[PDB]
Each structure stands twice: as structure tokens, then as C-alpha cells.
């Protein structure tokens, strides 16, 4: 294989420029499934990578996992094998009241709450998202007809104390953590996941494009149950969205 | 007066909600003669405010000074006076070999080399502008056929040291920032300048909109020295870009 | 299922109170298999569960995934389902001239480069092991003759920059971490990883006891590239010892 | 011109080797005004300077803007232009019981709550003024018997939040900033203010003297609106004060 | 003298490897007491250093003073002096519940509350004993029959402040010291004491091996006033802990 | 005793509020024996007190020990007896070339390169000395005739690399300070010593007067090994000089 762990050479990329990077490999086909000539590649720890095609080009499909690490090395490999673009697409908790389950969440930039993305630019650069991504993930979402929020994504290395979660085995958090969410919200800030601030921040300082959309599931502040059939649907509609912005980005 | 330091009241606004924000109190009556009935307001410290109409609506140009301090007090006080949006309008030295003397810069967001951004949000939280206004100006841009480079901008507190010139006093460079070039021209920043750091993080964190567009006239990669010219019709171009975004923005 | 994450509920444990934690979903399989009546749980994300009896006492193994954040979860969530004791397993490069291929290292403490751990406690807080599963992991690697270091490793959240590797796309290390290996090794550091940091210090700070043992595969200071074999022969002894150290925790 | 930002030739300034530095232009006039030979120099952006003869001897006074950034900018080009000891004088609020309206407070060295004083040395740094100059305004302060307090200045790159302003468009503070006066309160620290923080740092690390009185115009522990007549008194004693330490400098 | 501190020659140490370190000047005699040819070498500063011989093998013991300062000089000069392993021994308070007056503390690593310790290796790596010295002291605590609990400390520079501490001159703790004892609490830390941190920092990240054992004399959760009987009782406990350790360690 | 560790009862001062603080504990004896009825009260640990009387007041000296630990005890115990004021009395090495051996410098802030100060004020805080205490020591100076610096001294809690001494046992110096002296000696610091960053810190922000001097015994930029008749002439020295500064603050 050309790299150490994604388990993919060159030659089966077939010329591919841009990728779209879930976190779950169970959505990898999903994602594949809406575009032309769908081909598992490799699964291999949480890298499950599908090829497919968009308007005559290749697309790669393929999970980071759960964590700027494991991110991080997904870009690294999927950069080796010539991806430029990285699209991330999750479903995601809001924070703000006036957020709704189903509407989109498109990030401008992320609050670093991770460990890797300083391993590529110091705290102080930004996590932005790349105008171009962020715009197609704007006209794509809107080409569907999404109710869309334009905004500062919360990124943490932690599901349970970074996004202060007290339903958990010591149920404390840490004195650093503890009432940092309601500074996030104080903020404007508009949601929580785990793996932006790595994307952001590994591909602005290395001349890649990045952008990330989410559909939300959950609304913390007015916290509901999530019922199967519209997770299902929102995440299609991010599935979908997602894809839209690819086809504009090629 | 209504506001500590600007020397306006609510009634001298007459409903603007719009800011123009120039570093220079000079470049403020060049603005506003750009638009209709163009009227000086106030003039106390670094703050220039003029008032002109665009469109038929009220509109407020008002100088912040040099550095993230001035500028907070700036934002501040237009903010309690009804302003919403947040326009910095400058001219600039791009660190990167692909700009050009003449092209112009917007800018998604900004490595916080400042002491004001914090007092707002801690250093994780990104200096990102609004979507909005990155849009319209890069909008407004390509309306006059720029050439137009759209990234990441670093904003010091200082001119001589937090940005590598050493032909000063010293001639010396505080560790921390010697080397500290090389690093961000690696990661693609494009310039540097001293207040959307501060512009920036404020506004995000608040609920406010900002953005920010600049003209090129050096290249620290290829430097010439600039002729009066050159700055005019530099500043000139600038100036019409952020009137346009103004306009689009209203 | 009981959890977030795993697909685990409470019945599929039958009482385990101790899991052995690979980072590979891949090696969860092997380890199990190692021991009587071997069952598998689950499987999504890079969460691979297994379920085994050990001296007739049920034993978990589960993938944590590459990194903190994915570890964190995996840990907290079997937490949930009363594991007590988390084993890591893994293969490894050492850094020191003086570390072989075939040897083992067990780690009493690791150099905090990851994000996940401040979510539990400030950097200041060390990435310390149990000492009771230090010392069966030693005693185990003794019990089979292995040459075994016991010492410091640095816990990593990027495979490439984090560890100075620069053969990567871009080639360049940030500022932070170019230079880092020499000073890992001028301390003592006796390899990389990128999940030690998060599970020590969590655990730690929580009343859950860890330990972590590791055959080395490569050394980077006199680089061999490594035939299968030796990785399959290095992986089965680093598994018995693990199982050994497993056998005298329970 | 000689400098890029303040408008002034070498010459200009006729051999003065000392400044005193208000920070608005507004107050430049002012203190010109004691000396003889008063003749304004130039006024460009936040920069208004005079020249003055004190004792046969030429002494510059030039205003700073608010904020450590533009302050960085005019000692650099006044150290350029021959300026090595440099006197700010302010007015400002105490923070301290016993200080009362029209006290004058000398500052021994500041609390560095600013970004411009980290490009000039890393923050353990001390901010400190020059005894020369500190004494010369102790001594001054005895000359015309004000009632002097002699301690540490809090020196803030923000007006509103990092002063713990609470009156304000938001009306939160970041909680980095929410409740630190009561620890500068308990540690006797007299006073905040926005450019001493700057100033001390940048003339200690580079050989230069430099030296910083104020006089009270209100006490934020016992607050009273100013009186428009005390204010104005209040600034000539705290003006006069700095010319006569001026004049001991010389 | 060959050192700059302590006052010793090489020849005087008679080819001593090993060096017990306790903090009280006054404590060293006691311990040099129990071994064979107890000779005092040398009272100079903090610094009274007695040799002895522990099976016909020479052994250093040497007072460090309160604090990593002193101790780092201690280790420093025994090292250039041929002592490569430092056994500290203390007398403590707890703060965890359950640990009881007269009980011993292992520690496999600190919480690096100090500022020496940073001089040898950034506050990421950890503040861990060496493993070796860890079990010599666990085993030798059995071998008297000793209650042991094997853990984290929190290593502090101040007495006061830094453990929390009110009845002090001022009755304050500053802001980030203030709820820190909570905090180590909840993260299962064993005792307070000041120099373990300088200890095992420098001897972890310099080949030198170095372990702690302590004796409790106070429960901060549940205080009583220490009875002068049992504290000289648990004294000679630790000290004799520690000697068996050396034993083992020789 | 009144005090857990000086020895120390109330009436043992006999009323004295101004305490002569050396570091070794061998110089007590001989600064109380230049004033008035020399008693020794206590001696323990670094500890070792004298009482003694100058103009007819009673007066302390107290030894600190090595490093801003003990220091922060002595000054806090001290303080319980009713010591107010604090004078720091050394000998010590100059970074600079153009102070000689034999001069004296006297201490306006120091460069907290220690741990103890930050547990009374964040870093930001300046370590600051007493304008009072400072004008007595500089003023005392000039009466003998001394030759004097007045300026900025670097607080280090280690002899060995935070000076970057590289004659040591593993002539490495970490990453953090290697390179650190090069930039106090650009920033004008004049010495390297042990307790002043504590004993400063702790005094501004608590209410106490504190003050220090010291007499150069060697020049690094110059360095020549001093003899012992070089050293007393220039201890006498400074001893002289902080009783005549004593009489002054009495
Ligand atoms: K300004
Ligand atoms: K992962
Ligand atoms: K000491």
C-alpha cells in the first residue's frame, strides 16, 4: 500500500482531487451511494474508503474516526494521494435557542478545543474554513431548500467533560471545562463535534481547502429525544448538501 | 455626548447601522465624500466620525486608530450608538510571492498577535468574520475586476517587532516573534496588520458583523518602494470595494 | 445498547471487570482468541468488542482507536459498564539507541502531547500508570524472558508532525514541535504513541487503573524496515504478555 | 519624513533627547504649554506632537493614542529620533479606598494585561519604570505638595471588559476577566490604565528611561461623577508634576 | 571544594551510588544512625550531609532544604559527585479520606506544582519515579508491615498559599490556587509536599533513578493535632522504609 | 513556638518590624554583629534567626535558604511576627560587561524565573521592590561612595540551567531557557539570583515593603575566579550598605 494506514495507492484514486471525510465508516457508503460508479476501496481501523464518480470525476469517500488524530492522519494519507478538498459533513448538536433539529449548521471557523490542530500552527491561528468550501456548502444547502446558520463550531478531544456531559461514571468535570459551555454559548457559538478544529487548521496551513456541514439532531437547550426516522432524514439532507458543494468545488 | 470617548449621540447616527471602519482619521472624509450628503460629526482622539447616506440610508465612517485597544473602544461605542456591522477598510503589505502591488485582500479570519481579542474570548476562539461580509466584499471585488486573494491575515500589536523589521532601535527581535515570519508565510498568510484581531473576535463573540478588505501596496517577498500614485489609485480601489460591500450589506 | 458509542449493554460484560484496550479493531480478534471461550460483542466505529474468560473470570477487549478523543469515549463508556482495569497493548518505535527490535516497554508515565488529557486534569497532572498494572506487566514480560524497558513514552496526537516525521506532504514541522524528538530523547523517552496520555491520565484522576506494555517493531535512530514476521512474531509476544499481566489483575 | 507614522524629521526635534507621551493629542498643546519656544510639529493619525524648550533645552511631547499597539509605534520612531527617556502622564481611576480625587499616583512598575509588551519580552518580564525617572516624579509630586501614592498600575488593552466595565453593549465580561479586579484590588494594586504596560516594557528591555504619574479623577470603590472644574485642575497638577521631573531629567 | 554548595569532595563520598534525601538538616543524622560508620561529612547552608555504609557499601545522606531550588542544587552537586539514585523520604499530610496518621505514601509520580522542575523539561513530561526505586519502596514498606497506599502527589513551592492554607498573615489564596485542593482531591492525589516534583523531574529526564516514600502525621479531612509520640514513631517508620529500600536498590 | 517552622515566638522579636534577610544562614551572625546587642533567637532548618538593635530599635535577620520555597515561609512567618518590611542582602554574578566586581546593584523588579511568586499573583504581576526600601539601599549606596546599578535582576529557580551553566553533570540545558541568557543580557538585566521573584511578588501583593541589594563578586561576561579576601571586602560591603539602609526605614 502507498501509505501506513488508510491501505490505498495512488493509482486507486484514478485522479481524484477531493474527498468527503465523515467520521462514522457506516456512512462512507451512504455518501457514496448518492454519485455515479460506487467502489469500496479499503476498510482498515476506522478508515473505510469508497471511490466514486461526479459529473465524470472521481470523488473519494473515506471516515477519519472519532478525533483530530485519527483525522489528522486521514488528511495526511488522502493528501499524499493528491486530495486538495476535504468536505466533513456530521450531524451534530446545537446550543443556541434559535437553533431547530433538521436546520444546517454551515462552520466559518472553529474554537480549538483539540490537541492536534497545534501540532500544525500554534493557538493562536485560526481554524478558519476555506470561502470557497464554506460558499458551496452555503448555495448548496440552500439549493435544497435547508434552514441554514452561518457560524463558530466548538471543537473538543472529549465527547463526555469538553462538552460538559455530567451523566457519566464520576460525573465531574475538570475545573478548566467546568462552565465553559455556557461561555461558548455566551459566544454565539453554535454547536460541539470533535474533529474540525484538526481539519480546519491542518489544511489552512498547508494550502488545502476545507469546509464542514452538519445537520442538527439535538437541541441542548431544550433537549428532545432524537426520533430514528428524522436523524435518518437529516442526515440524508446533510449527506446530500455535502455532495452539491463537492460537485460546485470540482 | 452619548459614549465616553467618540463624541456622538444616538440623534448624530440618525438610524445608521452601518460602520465603515478606517485606521486613519484621514481616510475618513475620503469615504464618505464617496457617497451622498457626506457631513463631519466628530473628531476627538484616533476616532474621525464622518456620516454620509448609500442607497438612501444612513451610513457612519468612523476612524478606531492604530492597534486592538482604540479599536475596542471604537466598536464599543458605535455598538451602543446602533451600529451593527463592522467594515475595516486598509492598505497593506502582503508576505506572500503570489500577491501583487494592486490586488486586494479579504480576509476569513486572523492569528490573534494581539493583547484586546482576549479580553473577549480566550485564544482558542477563532478571529473569523462574518459570512455576510466576506461575501459582499469579495462580491464587491470581482464587480470591479480585482484580482482578489481571500484568506488568513496576521494582526499584531506591534509594527516593528511582531512583524520582523529590524531596521529600528534594537535591531533586535524578542525570541518569541524572531522566526515568527517564516512561520506564517509557510502557513499561507497572506498579510499582516494591527486591528482585526481585536475587530474580529469582538464582534464574533458579541453578536455583531465585521469584515475586512485591504489593498496591496508592498510585497515584503519582492519589496519596492511604493509611489504617492500607486497608494492613491491603491487606496482609491479599496475604498469603492468596501462602499460597494456597504451598499450590499444594507 | 446501554451506550453511546460501543453497542455494549451491561448482560454482554457477564461481571468483566477488566479490558485489555488495543488500539486496532483488527487485533481484538487476536487477543481473544488467546483466551477461553472467545465471543465478539460488537462492532462499530472503531470500537471492536470482544468478550473471553481468563482463569475462569470474563475479560473484555476493545479498540479504542487511534487517539485520545476516540479513547476517551471507549474508556468512559465501558467505565459505565464497570470496567475497573484498562491494559493497552501495542507495537511500537523506539527513539533510544540502546532499545532493540523484539523488546518490550511498559510505560510508567507518558509526555502529555495529546488534547484529550486536559479534559481531565491540567497539564501539571501526571500521565502516570497503576502500579499494580505496571508492575504485572513487567513481571509478565519477565515471566516469558523478554528484555523489557520501563520508563517514559511521548503520547503523540498526530503520527507525522507530533513525532517529526517529514517525509508527509508538506515537509515542514511547526515551530512547537521541530526539535522536539532530540529532547524526548536527550530525557530519556523511550518511544511514540498516540493514545498513553489520554488513558493514564484519565484513568488516574478517576480511580481507574491502567497500564500499558508495547513490543517494538522499529528503532528510528538506526531504521530497519521491518519483515512481517518480526511484526507478527513481536505482536504475539507483546499479546502474551499483555494476557499474563491481564491473568494476575484479575 | 523621516518615521513612517509620526511626520518628523530628525532635525525637527532640534538635539531633544526627552518626550513626554499623554496618550490623547488634545492634552500635547497643554503641556507644551508650560515650557518655552512652544511650536506644534506635525499631526498625523493618533500623533500630535509639539517641541518645547525646558531650561534652554529641547523636550518633544508627542501624543501616544490609546493602546499599547500605537504606543509601541511612537516611542520606536521617537527612539529613532533621538528620544531616550520618555514620561507618560494620564488621569485615571483608582481602584483603592484610600486614594481619593485628586491624589497623584507615581507607578513603580504595571500589571501586563496588554499584547504589545509580550513583543518586546515574554511576560515574567517586569513592566517596570526607571528609578530616575520614578524618582524625579516623586520629588516633583513633593515640589508643588501633592498627595502622592507610590505602587503598581494595572495596565489593560481594553477599556471596557478587561476593567471589569459592566455598563457596556453585552454587558458580560470573558470569564478570564470576570472578577480579576478584586484580585488586583486585594494584591494593592492603585489604578488601571492602557498604556504603561507597553511603555515600561519596551524602554526596560531596550535601554531606555522611562516613567509614569497620573492624577485621580475618580475612585471606582466609592464612585462620584468628575467635576468638569476638578478634572481640569487635576490635569494641571498631574501635567505640571511631569514637567517638573522633565526638568530633573534633563 | 569540588562543588559550589554542598561543601564535598569526591573522595569523601568513598565511591557512594546512593543518597537518601530528606529536607530537614535534622532528620539526616537520625537516618545516618541506622546504618554502619555513620560519619558527618559536612553542614553548610540547608545542606548537612552524613556518610554511612549499608552492607559494606558506602550511602550518602544529604538534607536538600524546603523546596525544588535547593534540591535541584543538591542533586546537581551529589550527581557530579557519583550518587545516581535519590531516595526523598518526608513526613506528610493527607487529603484523601481514607488514608490514616501513621499510614506510608509511595509516589509514582506529581502534580508539578514548582517552578525547578520546568528548568529540566516542560510541564508536559511527567513528574515520575523511576520504577525500580517505586517497587524498593513498596516491598521495603512491607517488609516492617507498614498500611501503604501507592499514588499521586501534589508537589507545591509554597506552604501556604499553594496548599491552601487561611490562617495565614493575609487569610487569602490567589485566584488560580483558590479550589485547586478540591480539584487534586477529586483526582485522587494523596498529600501536599515541596519537592518531589524538582525531584523526580530532574532525575527522570537526566538517567538518574530517584523514589519517595512519606509517613502521615495529619489527615487534612478529618485534622487532629499530631501527638509528639506518634509522629517521632512514623518518623523512624519512613526512615526505615527507606533505608530497606536502599537496600534493595545498592 | 508561635510559628510552624522559624522557632520563633512574638516576644522573641521584642517588637521588631523590619527583618535583614540574607539567603545563608551562616551570614545572620555576622550582620546582626555590625548593630547594637546581637542575640541569636533560633536556628533551624535554612532558618537562623538573630535579634539585634540599631538607632534603639530592635531589628531581625533572618536567613531565607536557597529558592523562593523557603523563602515564601520565612517572609510568611515573619510576617506573623510582625515583620513589615523586608530587606534582601547578597553577592552575585553580572550578565553585563560594563559592571565590575566590587559594585553594587540594587533591585527595582526582578524576571520571575521561579514558581513560588505565581502563588500570590499571576505572571502578569510585576515583581516589583518598595519605591521606600529601594530609594534607602540606593541612597545608602551612594553614602559609602559604592559604584551602583540600579535595574532589572532575573529570578531563577535553579543555579544550574536556568543561568545556562553548562559545566554540570549533563551539560544539557532544556529547550525553554537554553538560548534564555542571551536575552536578559539584550533586556538589560544586570544579574542572575535565587529569591528575589518570590520575596518581591509576595511583598507588592501583600501589603509588605521589600527591598534587595547585592555586591558582584564575579563578571560572566568577564570571568575571573574570584579570591576569598575579594569576596569578604565586598560582602562587608553590601552587609554595610542594607544596615545603613535599615537605620533609614527604621
Ligand atoms: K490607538
Ligand atoms: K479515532
Ligand atoms: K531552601
Redesign the interface.
Known sequence: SDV??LGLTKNDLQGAQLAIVP????RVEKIAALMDKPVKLAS???FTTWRAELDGKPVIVCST??????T??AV?EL??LGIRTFLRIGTTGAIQPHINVGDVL?T?????????S??????????????EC??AL?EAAKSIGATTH???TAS???????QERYD???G?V????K??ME?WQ???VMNYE??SATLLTMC????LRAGMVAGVIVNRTQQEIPNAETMKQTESHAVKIVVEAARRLL
Chains 1, 2, 3, 4, 5, 6 share one sequence.
Open positions: 501506513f494506514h467520521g462514522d465508516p457506516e482498515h481501523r476506522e474516526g472519532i478525533g483530530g488524530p485519527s489528522s492522519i495526511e493528501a499524499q454551515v466559518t471557523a472553529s474554537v480549538r478545543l483539540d490537541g492536534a497545534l501540532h500544525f500552527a500554534p493557538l493562536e491561528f485560526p481554524a478558519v474554513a476555506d470561502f464554506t460558499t452555503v452561518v457560524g463558530v473538543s478531544d472529549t465527547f463526555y467533560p469538553g457519566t461514571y464520576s465531574r475538570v475545573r478548566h471545562f462552565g465553559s461561555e455566551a459566544m454565539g470533535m474533529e489552512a496551513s498547508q494550502g
